Amino acid sequence: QLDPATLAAFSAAFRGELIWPSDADYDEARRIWNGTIDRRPALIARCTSTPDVVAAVSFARKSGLLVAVRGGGHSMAGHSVCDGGIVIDLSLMNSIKVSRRLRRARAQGGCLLGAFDTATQAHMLATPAGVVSHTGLGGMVLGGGFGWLSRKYGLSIDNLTSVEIVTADGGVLTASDTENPDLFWAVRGGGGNFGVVTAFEFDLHRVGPVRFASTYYSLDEGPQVIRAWRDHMATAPDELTWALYLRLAPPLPELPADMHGKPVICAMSCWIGDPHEGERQLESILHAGKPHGLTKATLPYRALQAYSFPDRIYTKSGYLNELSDEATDTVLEHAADIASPFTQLELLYLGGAVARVPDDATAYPNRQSPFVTNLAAAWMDPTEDARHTAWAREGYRALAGHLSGGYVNFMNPGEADRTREAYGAAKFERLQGVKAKYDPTNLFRLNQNIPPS
Amino acid sequence: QLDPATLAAFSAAFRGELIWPSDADYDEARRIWNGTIDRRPALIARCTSTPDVVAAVSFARKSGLLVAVRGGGHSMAGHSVCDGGIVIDLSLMNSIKVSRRLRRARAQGGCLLGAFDTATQAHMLATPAGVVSHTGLGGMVLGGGFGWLSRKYGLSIDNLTSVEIVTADGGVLTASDTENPDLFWAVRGGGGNFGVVTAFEFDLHRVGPVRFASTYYSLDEGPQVIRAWRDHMATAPDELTWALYLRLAPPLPELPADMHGKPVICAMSCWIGDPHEGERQLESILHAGKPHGLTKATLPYRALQAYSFPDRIYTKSGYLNELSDEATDTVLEHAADIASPFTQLELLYLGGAVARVPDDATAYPNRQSPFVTNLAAAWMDPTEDARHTAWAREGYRALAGHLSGGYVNFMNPGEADRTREAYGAAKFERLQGVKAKYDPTNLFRLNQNIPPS
Numbered sequence: 001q002l003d004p005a006t007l008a009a010f011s012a013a014f015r016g017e018l019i020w021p022s023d024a025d026y027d028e029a030r031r032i033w034n035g036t037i038d039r040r041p042a043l044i045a046r047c048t049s050t051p052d053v054v055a056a057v058s059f060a061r062k063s064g065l066l067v068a069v070r071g072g073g074h075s076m077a078g079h080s081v082c083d084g085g086i087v088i089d090l091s092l093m094n095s096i097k098v099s100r101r102l103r104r105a106r107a108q109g110g111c112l113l114g115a116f117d118t119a120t121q122a123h124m125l126a127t128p129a130g131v132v133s134h135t136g137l138g139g140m141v142l143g144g145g146f147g148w149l150s151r152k153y154g155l156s157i158d159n160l161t162s163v164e165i166v167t168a169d170g171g172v173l174t175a176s177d178t179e180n181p182d183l184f185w186a187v188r189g190g191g192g193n194f195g196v197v198t199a200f201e202f203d204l205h206r207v208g209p210v211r212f213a214s215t216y217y218s219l220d221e222g223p224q225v226i227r228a229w230r231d232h233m234a235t236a237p238d239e240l241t242w243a244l245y246l247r248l249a250p251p252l253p254e255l256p257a258d259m260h261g262k263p264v265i266c267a268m269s270c271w272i273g274d275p276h277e278g279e280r281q282l283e284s285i286l287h288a289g290k291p292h293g294l295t296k297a298t299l300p301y302r303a304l305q306a307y308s309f310p311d312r313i314y315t316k317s318g319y320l321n322e323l324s325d326e327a328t329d330t331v332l333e334h335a336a337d338i339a340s341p342f343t344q345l346e347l348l349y350l351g352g353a354v355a356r357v358p359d360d361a362t363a364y365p366n367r368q369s370p371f372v373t374n375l376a377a378a379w380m381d382p383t384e385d386a387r388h389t390a391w392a393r394e395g396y397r398a399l400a401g402h403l404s405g406g407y408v409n410f411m412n413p414g415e416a417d418r419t420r421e422a423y424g425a426a427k428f429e430r431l432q433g434v435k436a437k438y439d440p441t442n443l444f445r446l447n448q449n450i451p452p453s
Numbered sequence: 454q455l456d457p458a459t460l461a462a463f464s465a466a467f468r469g470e471l472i473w474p475s476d477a478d479y480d481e482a483r484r485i486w487n488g489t490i491d492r493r494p495a496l497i498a499r500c501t502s503t504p505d506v507v508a509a510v511s512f513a514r515k516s517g518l519l520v521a522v523r524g525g526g527h528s529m530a531g532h533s534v535c536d537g538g539i540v541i542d543l544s545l546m547n548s549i550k551v552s553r554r555l556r557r558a559r560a561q562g563g564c565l566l567g568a569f570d571t572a573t574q575a576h577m578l579a580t581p582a583g584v585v586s587h588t589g590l591g592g593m594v595l596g597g598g599f600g601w602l603s604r605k606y607g608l609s610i611d612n613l614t615s616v617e618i619v620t621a622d623g624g625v626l627t628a629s630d631t632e633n634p635d636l637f638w639a640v641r642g643g644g645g646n647f648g649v650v651t652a653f654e655f656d657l658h659r660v661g662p663v664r665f666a667s668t669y670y671s672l673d674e675g676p677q678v679i680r681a682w683r684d685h686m687a688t689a690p691d692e693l694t695w696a697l698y699l700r701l702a703p704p705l706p707e708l709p710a711d712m713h714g715k716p717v718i719c720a721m722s723c724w725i726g727d728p729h730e731g732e733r734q735l736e737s738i739l740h741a742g743k744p745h746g747l748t749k750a751t752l753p754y755r756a757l758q759a760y761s762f763p764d765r766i767y768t769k770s771g772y773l774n775e776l777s778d779e780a781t782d783t784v785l786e787h788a789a790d791i792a793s794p795f796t797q798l799e800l801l802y803l804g805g806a807v808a809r810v811p812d813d814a815t816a817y818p819n820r821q822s823p824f825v826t827n828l829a830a831a832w833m834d835p836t837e838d839a840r841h842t843a844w845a846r847e848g849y850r851a852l853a854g855h856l857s858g859g860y861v862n863f864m865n866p867g868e869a870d871r872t873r874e875a876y877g878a879a880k881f882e883r884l885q886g887v888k889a890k891y892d893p894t895n896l897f898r899l900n901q902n903i904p905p906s
């Protein structure tokens with residue numbers, strides 16, 4: 001319901017694709033990974049260049065259209081699609097340049113992680129990021145970004161060296177340690193609040209074959225496995241990463257059919273370092289219970305990335321400073337109640353290099369909390385929403401006093417209120433000052449939102 | 454030194470990046486995967502859109518510049534870089550659209566395979582392609598394209614539904630079964646001979662987790678393993694793929710320290726189908742020798758793709774109709790002479806769905822030859838070029854009388870003359886007829902070249 005001259009100026013400056021509610025590919029272009037989010041934008045603007053983004057930002061600003069920005073569409077809160085506004089869709093901006101000599105990568109703001117890992121691994125290089133290949137680099141890096149390499153090399157933001165960004169006034173800025181360093185501070189963990197990142201520059205590291213193990217323990221041996229896990233990681237070397245996924249056992253041939261469809265602890269571990277030393281380290285942590293369905297391999301890092309691991313999702317997540325035996329029994333009891341074969345209760349351990357960055361150095365909070373738990377409900381039948389949502393919420397409720405803060409990138413669509421708790425008073429206020437400078441009208445609000453001033 | 458108005462018209466129509474010999478990133482941008490190829494283009498034109506390619510093709514045509522086209526830069530013949538001409542570099546055109554409803558993907562002509570597989574596997578979908586994720590989709594598809602999925606679902610070209618292509622006169626055409634079907638026939642196996650493909654459209658298939666095994670046999674049981682392999686694949690189901698790589702044993706922890714550095718047979722297999730059936734089938738073929746370093750897993754297809762497996766390369770390859778005992782001892786004798794730790798002698802079995810497509814249906818030749826052998830020499834030291842090339846060429850000549858044809862995508866920089874034998878006379882001449890229509894002046898000649906008329 002738009003101004004004809006503003007539209008004509010927009011389309012005149014726009015070399016991407018416009019998708020209207022009447023167009024065929026409207027219904028698919030508006031779907032995101034969280035299929036509980038069903039929203040109808042006025043327009044989807046599939047940008048293909050930084051000038052495209054400039055045009056779309058300016059057009060939304062002048063039209064007063066609610067702006068959703070979409071990288072890979074993995075927002076657990078559904079932030080990358082809007083009712084009645086414009087989607088500034090970056091999914092066609094997925095170009096990457098990798099320099100081996102520089103050991104640097106430049107990636108457009110709509111890249112998927114798997115394309116970035118593919119390009120860097122052509123030269124045996126990598127930078128830390130999440131564990132699922134089709135996650136967008138856009139939202140993930142801007143919230144921090146952690147995965148297999150983080151204990152060794154830090155968060156994705158700890159390897160980011162500069163961004164190209166389009167601000168709410170239509171300008172293009174570079175942000176780095178030497179240019180607009182307040183903005184470069186804020187985008188390292190402050191989400192999409194401050195503008196559209198059209199390019200990320202990363203330092204890369206040499207990562208060769210990785211020793212990897214995945215196995216399944218019966219919940220019978222739950223208390224010993226989890227306590228071994230929490231105790232080992234308190235003093236584990238940086239090179240070891242080890243994560244627990246409590247879930248129904250998949251009906252896979254390495255597992256006895258007995259265990260199929262029943263709650264188990266799936267344990268995944270890797271050693272970022274010499275595979276022969278990795279074999280030693282993994283063996284010392286594989287035997288806290290009897291491992292079933294054991295898979296061991298020496299993998300290219302791109303294949304570790306591709307290994308992990310569902311239409312409707314709901315998550316509740318937070319950090320812990322410690323995992324007591326009492327919290328451990330809580331996790332095991334709620335895991336025993338898992339109904340869907342797609343649902344997981346994730347237990348992750350960060351720390352290491354993530355924890356050695358001074359807390360004030362970026363906008364990412366809670367570096368000093370090493371534990372992360374993610375109650376990730378996933379299902380197919382829309383008529384069962386209440387039961388699955390209830391499982392994640394009741395599990396979070398049972399763990400509440402052990403949990404603090406929160407990872408903005410695991411928030412769900414009802415968790416707008418958690419933004420203050422997530423960053424903490426000092427950070428939130430410091431960010432609120434960056435927002436008043438760079439987004440004073442809060443044009444970019446579909447995110448873990450930081451209102452200006 | 455070029456016409457200033459032609460240059461200026463070119464630049465006026467070009468929104469991509471131009472890299473000149475004086476620019477910093479020139480020396481890296483002109484490098485390709487085969488590091489024995491050292492060439493200095495007059496200009497590198499990094500195209501970002503189909504109109505960019507139109508501009509570059511016409512500019513090369515009016516200027517009379519020798520045209521190299523670059524997708525992922527994996528040309529074993531070094532065709533993606535030239536001395537004195539223009540490189541039409543597509544590497545920034547890697548946008549992909551996947552429709553889950555349609556089971557279709559559209560990919561730009563500069564895509565790397567890993568980016569494509571990431572995008573399709575977000576929906577548990579795939580289409581057949583090569584086994585190394587940083588191969589370009591461009592050269593691979595135009596030559597045929599085969600890999601883990603091919604025995605079940607055919608070649609990449611057997612799932613291609615259309616292309617957008619820029620021809621030598623600057624026009625943009627669609628080629629499909631219903632539009633320009635002579636061109637659609639030629640691009641399915643005829644290489645870059647007929648124009649620059651700016652977008653590929655593919656049918657996709659649902660590919661869930663695949664049971665996979667890799668193991669190593671001593672060359673001592675070589676005859677037994679290879680004869681079991683050739684005998685088993687003659688009657689194997691489509692769902693089974695099984696490939697042998699003769700090579701020095703990598704210094705990996707799953708293998709006994711003895712074998713490290715010694716010629717071995719690395720055997721890799723997967724079952725495209727039910728993993729429990731896969732487990733049964735793989736166990737039935739893993740014990741033709743004593744398997745060392747056995748790795749078995751149930752993998753997402755994207756992780757299979759990422760699993761496989763150097764600065765200077767030289768390959769000699771061909772097809773066989775049968776693998777006799779005489780040829781098998783030949784393969785084992787030359788494999789024993791492997792000195793490089795990056796060199797592989799590959800034994801592949803195609804057949805299956807690839808062989809069920811009528812021979813005249815595409816320009817891909819030799820569908821009815823199921824075996825492929827590839828002597829893939831790889832090394833680092835430019836001073837050793839002669840010994841490694843000699844190992845690959847001597848191995849080929851010893852196997853030559855069992856060999857017919859050749860896959861254009863495995864041809865080395867000295868194999869320009871192998872083009873007629875590869876396609877065969879009947880196909881080659883029909884291809885020359887399509888070339889006379891669409892590229893009459895042979896503008897596109899850095900490829901396994903088919904001269905017009």
Ligand SMILES: Cc1cc2nc3c(=O)[nH]c(=O)nc-3n(C[C@H](O)[C@H](O)[C@H](O)COP(=O)(O)OP(=O)(O)OC[C@H]3O[C@@H](n4cnc5c(N)ncnc54)[C@H](O)[C@@H]3O)c2cc1C
Nearest residue numbers: 071072073074075080109130131136138139140146192197
């Ligand atoms: C299956 C799954 C696995 C995951 N695994 C991990 C993991 O291992 N580690 C981890 O740290 N996280 C993980 N995540 C979380 C992921 O980091 C976040 O969901 C992130 O927001 C995804 O970004 P996106 O571009 O894909 O999402 P979107 O839906 O496109 O965007 C997310 C948010 O970022 C904004 N945004 C996106 N791109 C840009 C851009 N270029 N410029 C400005 N704003 C932008 C959007 O406006 C929105 O606020 C996972 C998520 C899923 C669904």
Ligand SMILES: Cc1cc2nc3c(=O)[nH]c(=O)nc-3n(C[C@H](O)[C@H](O)[C@H](O)COP(=O)(O)OP(=O)(O)OC[C@H]3O[C@@H](n4cnc5c(N)ncnc54)[C@H](O)[C@@H]3O)c2cc1C
Nearest residue numbers: 524525526527528533562583584589591592593599645650
């Ligand atoms: C490590 C490795 C593994 C491989 N594995 C496999 C495998 O498993 N299966 C398989 O079938 N092949 C495989 N190949 C071979 C591969 O198919 C060919 O090398 C292919 O030519 C590479 O394509 P590219 O775009 O990466 O190469 P480039 O060097 O960029 O180009 C190769 C040729 O294609 C032309 N070309 C490329 N893109 C286009 C386009 N869009 N339009 C027009 N012409 C174009 C170029 O002009 C040139 O003649 C492998 C190669 C390597 C090096």
